[PDB]
């Protein structure tokens, strides 16, 4: 089921999420939350969603873009469940990106995050991962994990001048679209 | 006439406004702009409006609020025209306030500005003023003058965590330190 996505200003979005116990990843409550998170993320046309965004303060993140692998210019993100993630930047190098957030509807801002990170996490099967992530996925993962620390991208804007409403930003900076 | 209020993201809002001349304040063009600015401010239920907010890069600010609905706890501000304002803080002491902006619709952010300032300006009659402003008017005036410098309150947020959408900010309580 699609759940309500909390918007910026809601204190929950700024709380710290607690780790998920392996003793709860097989429960129906967890499986339901996961399904609900994917429904919500997809219905909202997002590429990622963190549990706190729907009011659950647990270190649970679902990501996934659909049909972007063969779509030029639009990076894909394989669907997956990310639990108890821990990210460590591997570089000072950053890639700027006009990020948006389901909890900050109608806006976007320029954010520069390390373009190479180390992420440790567990999936819904209890599998443990420790990989080097880069590019787009690196941005998405950091964005998502920030949520688990009560951090929104507006907290990381490169400059408040590079921030605004989608339609205003679109109509003020045109391209051959 | 009510004019369109530019939203955050529009480059104009970040430009510097030019001074208005004494001869200029007597022109019909200026008066039409003034009337339009008040119409716009009132129709939008604002307490202030700077010329750049409607696309005019001139140091023109109109203020005034009667039983304002957008800021229910604030004191009424008599309508007046403020031209070529220059503000100098007289104190380091600040009063926090959940500010909003007609150019940043649907949001509010906690901003702490000096609660005592010196403002020099000219009204539409060419009168020169040099007064000590404090309290609410001090906040409104600084907010408005910031517009003339291409500055929005989001540039002065005490903390990005104390920022969000009004609907949620009215429903929930964010504890201030
Ligand atoms: Zn987000
Ligand atoms: Zn404003």
Curated annotation (Swiss-Prot), chains A, B:
Organism: Leptospira interrogans serogroup Icterohaemorrhagiae serovar Lai (strain 56601)
Role description: Removes the formyl group from the N-terminal Met of newly synthesized proteins. Requires at least a dipeptide for an efficient rate of reaction. N-terminal L-methionine is a prerequisite for activity but the enzyme has broad specificity at other positions.
Gene Ontology molecular functions: metal ion binding; peptide deformylase activity
Family that this chain belongs to: Belongs to the polypeptide deformylase family.
Protein name as catalogued: Peptide deformylase
Requisite cofactors: Fe(2+)
Description of how the protein assembles with itself and partners: Homodimer.
Stored Gene3D superfamilies: Peptide deformylase (3.90.45.10)
Keywords carried by this UniProt record: Hydrolase, Iron, Metal-binding, Protein biosynthesis
Positions with a binding annotation for Fe cation: 101, 143, 147
Catalytic class of the enzyme: hydrolase
Note accompanying the cofactor annotation: Binds 1 Fe(2+) ion.
Annotated InterPro entries: Peptide_deformylase, Peptide_deformylase_sf
Residues annotated as catalytic: 144
